[PDB]
RNA sequence: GGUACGGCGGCCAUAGCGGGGGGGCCACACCCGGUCUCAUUUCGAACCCGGAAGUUAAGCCCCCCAGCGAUCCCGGUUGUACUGCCCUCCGAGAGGGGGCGGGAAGCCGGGGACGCCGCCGGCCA
RNA sequence: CUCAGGCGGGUCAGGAAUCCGCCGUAGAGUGCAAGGGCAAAAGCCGGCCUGACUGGACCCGUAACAGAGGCGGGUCCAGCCCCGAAAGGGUGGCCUAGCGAACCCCUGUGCCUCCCCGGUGGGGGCCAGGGAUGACAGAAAAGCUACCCUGGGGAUAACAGAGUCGUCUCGGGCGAGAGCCCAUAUCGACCCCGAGGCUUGCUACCUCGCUGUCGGCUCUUCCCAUCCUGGCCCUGCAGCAGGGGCCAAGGGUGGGGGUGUUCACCCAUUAAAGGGGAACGUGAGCUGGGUUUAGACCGUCGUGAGACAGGUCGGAUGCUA
RNA sequence: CAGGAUGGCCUCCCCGGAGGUAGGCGGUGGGGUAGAGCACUGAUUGGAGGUGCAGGGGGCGAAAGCCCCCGGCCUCCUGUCAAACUCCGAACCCACCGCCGCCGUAGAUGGGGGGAGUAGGGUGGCGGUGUAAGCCGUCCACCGAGAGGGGAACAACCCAGACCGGGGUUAAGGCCCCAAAGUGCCGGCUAAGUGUUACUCCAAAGGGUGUCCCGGGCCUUAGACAGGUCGAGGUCCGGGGCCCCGAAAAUGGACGGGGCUCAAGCCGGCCGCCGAGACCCCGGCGCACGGACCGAUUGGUCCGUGAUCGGGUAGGCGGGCGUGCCGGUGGCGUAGAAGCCGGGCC
RNA sequence: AUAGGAGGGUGCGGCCCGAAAGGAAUGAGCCUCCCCGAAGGAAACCGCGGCGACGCGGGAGUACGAGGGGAGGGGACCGGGGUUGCACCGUCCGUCUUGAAACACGGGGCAGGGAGUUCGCGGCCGUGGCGAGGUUAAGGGGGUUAAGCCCCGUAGCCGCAGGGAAACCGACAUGCCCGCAGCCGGGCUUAUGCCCGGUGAGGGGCGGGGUGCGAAAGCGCCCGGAGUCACGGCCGCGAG
């Protein structure tokens, strides 16, 4: 039987933490900074429901384009399309 | 140093990477041989793509003459003394010895085409092409042994 | 510059749990009393207001361990289990094998580990 | 503020009423399935409130790559507000389900408009919310055909062929046990390994611009896993006979009753009255009893036309090689 | 649902101007599969210890109660598991950055426009399902849409991807004859015509003092076994190679056939020789791109590069050949036009 | 009249034909000799290695080698064609289909006929005219044997200004930045060519502007002049 994608399809692991990673994570991540261009990886924090990117971008790495309220802009290249996503913080970290 | 790798296997049966590593390699035909660095990059490569070629070192003796009997300038022209000695200053011994020992490099000389189109071997190869030449088949790795193949291939 | 002094943090167990010894210049506490501020779906138990008669008993601070938990290094099991590419290699089949490239988990033995580190201030000098 | 559960102690009070202390990483709970997340909370108990709001942008998903009406979600600007000391939080439910085009109609709210002009009644238009299509990207909708017709399909069934052998038939390994003792004279549990394509089934590979079915008669031929006929071995083989097994396919394996029957049952003989393959051999050889059209009767089902792998009577067989 | 639309994959033309990434090395991130394991959730044999636990049943006692077991629940030991388990966890895959390599100013990545075809796929490896065949996905290798040389023929397996005329060497594989090339060489094995099968086709459990060997043993050269006397090695066990039994079918017959036994079979190797349109060379044609020169309508001659051009179904694009008639231009024919039969040349 | 394959393919050999159009007495097949020769490539014999099949060094890159030339002798064939023989290879044509020699369908032979046509609208491209303009339609006059030919014909249609359902309102003739080709200057380069610095049409991007929704912000569409007509071609829709 045919199913449709959804947020949280088959995310079952994907989206779990480690026993030892249960509660809220340090701040550095949530209050961390970026300037336009540079290049951070997409790791979703599941405890943090807002601001979240589909889940199907998990661990890509995307170039900051911009920045609208508390998100910052990340650009991405799915096969030949770009892709904007309006993503928090404490979903990135930077490269290097 | 300084590697000889030539195309064993033919242009058939063979997956899109592999055929696109031996297009970078310039190795589109068969019983086709280059000349490249010991580099990891084309450590890589050859581990890429070694089960359709063999590869091996080359001598000073040997490269000299590859480049005097199957070098080619563009436009299929033979290279010959006169040539190299006008262009360079020196005899295909001391341009191959150079080469070798890493003082230069093939392009230096101008207009000489980087793939050599050997012959096929006299004798034929001493194993098949379905095994590697560490069991005696005609694959892989070969090590000095190479020589006497480009020798036999002219 | 010292200090078995405190406040705000970083990594978030190699840092935890459980044990042993040591301390009260200042500082941190226990603690004396609830008119005023604040509160109990009763209780000044907590929270809050007012202080020093006593105490270092313990929170805290200094030092130590390897019982549990965690986790780093080395040696054995072991280049074992497993696996990427090629194969006119074997096997009735299941499946295995050769060449090049990767390579565990658990267990056993010997070490490590009872946390590092940053900004400022108090007291003394 | 901290749960489920457990331990020790308490008047009625016990397994379970209501309490007190300790252990307790969540083993509780979430409005609901499952997954994930949540412990000075997102859980429990309280205070206030309605942001479950108005005017709009950009982006992700349904629908990767790679097109989309509708729908859901995310990040924001402005307005008027809620909570809070403040930071900060609020565009419904901790995240993922609980729903839907065109046309038409109802409601709110302001504006435009109705054929030469002006007023009145009424109509039309723009924006927002609602009434449903579950076949859920949205026709309003019951059956028989055996009197059937047409265009196709071996993209797709029934017979046969092909693959497989679950099943079918026939062998083997081990040996618990039965056989006065004795496993193997004979039978051989519970388990396990195979052969054939002779029953049935599964698949859908060839054949639907046509390869005529079951049964019987006539005739030809082949396999052995042999019923008799030839020769042997073991025996719980005294003889006459039996049980098990081996070599062996030259010959035979017949006649009748009911039934369309193959088969099975029965009768009298016989050495025996073996099982099968050949397009389930053989309809350009025969017969046409069964099966499967068109007529008709009975039973049952259906309001009905009708249907029945339910009976029953009748129902064509082309040929100049 | 034997049919269509939007996309994906093909082709032709044009704009844009400086980059791009199929392969590889190193780095920064993501993962929870194979394997493994019990630290959670759910299963799982027995034993030991602790708990009266609504267990439950008996001894014991008018009754309240104790003493026995069995059961339930915890800790440990012991012996086992998981597609809907995970304290761990690869190979490997993906995103991005630097570089090597390759492609690109003879114009790529990219953008616009015109025309399509395609909506039954098959074989092969992997995954779920099924007794199996098969069904359903996935991998893009081969046929579809693919020549030539082999596997006896064979879609799919091996070599191999192909313009035309020649010469040579090799590939798959092959060398007793059919049939080009050895009755080739050394060491060993097989006695079964086993075999003469890379794969498309191939019979098992179970057994064999049948042979050739390896490794462990106990006795062990006047002493060990076969029958207290001889007087040289015995008696077991676990394995490896080949072979043997287990092994019955229908027209007469299948290692392709003949046939083959220190082989013409099988093992561990080796040496020569044959064998493709593949590789090299000579001459020729066309095509793509660039250049020079030259045409009064799309062009023509020549030159330079092509290891990085030459198979082809659906389909796209360019050139060319042929027929009737009309406006021009230049002509042929009764000394024989068109038409018709047989030949030469391009 | 002892021989097997869809009737053919490659090569040659018998028998036969062979004036013309093909070469050829200005020399054909043919015989002899000489020179250069790409890729490739032996052996006699000498020495050595190996148990052996055999190999290594010299001979030797020699004889030979596709082909490219020359000289001598002879004097009429060669190319081509019909049939047939030998060796090897080859299971017809069209079609649906994953798959055709097929026991799947259409296929006795020959000749003749036979199936992307026309109009309307629309999107594109190849070319030509004119150009902020383009272009006629019906129709009229002249001339003509004639329907050919010449001129007129601005009604009409498209474009020049877009936004909105409507009322209605109503825009850059360049303010600025990157920048290809070309141009200018300089360096290397024999030259080509490359590199560097400016200007840069066309191109891209900002800024500003009109209108619709709004309280505004902000967004959608649009704005710094290229369209129109004609001939031919591809395609979409409707007509058989």
Same mark, same amino acid.
């Given at each position: 039987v045919q199913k449709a994608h959804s947020f949280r399809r088959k995310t079952r692991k994907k989206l779990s933490k480690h026993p030892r990673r249960r509660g809220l994570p340090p701040l550095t991540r949530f209050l961390q900074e970026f300037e336009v261009g540079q290049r951070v990886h997409i790791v979703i924090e599941?405890?943090?429901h807002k601001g979240m990117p589909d889940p199907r971008f998990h661990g890509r790495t995307g170039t900051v384009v911009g920045k609208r309220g508390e998100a910052y802009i990340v650009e991405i290249k799915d096969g030949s399309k770009v892709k904007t996503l309006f993503i928090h913080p404490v979903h990135l970290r930077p490269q290097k | 140093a300084k590697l000889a790798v030539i195309r064993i296997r033919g242009?058939?049966?063979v997956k899109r990477p592999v055929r696109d590593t031996l297009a970078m390699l310039?190795?589109?035909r068969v019983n086709h041989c280059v000349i490249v660095d010991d580099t990891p990059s084309y450590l890589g490569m050859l581990q890429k793509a070694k089960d359709y070629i063999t590869?091996? $070192?080359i001598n000073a003796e040997t490269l000299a003459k590859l480049i005097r *009997? =199957?070098?080619r300038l563009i436009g299929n022209k033979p290279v010959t003394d006169e040539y190299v000695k006008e262009k360079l200053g020196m005899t295909i011994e001391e341009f191959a010895q150079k080469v070798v020992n890493g003082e230069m490099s093939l392009k230096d000389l101008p207009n000489l @085409?980087?793939?050599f189109r050997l012959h096929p071997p006299r004798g034929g190869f001493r194993g098949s *092409? *379905? =095994?590697s030449? @560490? $069991?005696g088949g005609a694959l892989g790795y070969r090590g000095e042994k190479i020589n006497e193949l480009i020798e036999r291939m002219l």
């Open positions: 599941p405890s943090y | 242009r058939v049966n310039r190795l589109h590869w091996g $070192e *009997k =199957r070098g @085409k980087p793939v *092409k *379905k =095994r030449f @560490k $069991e």
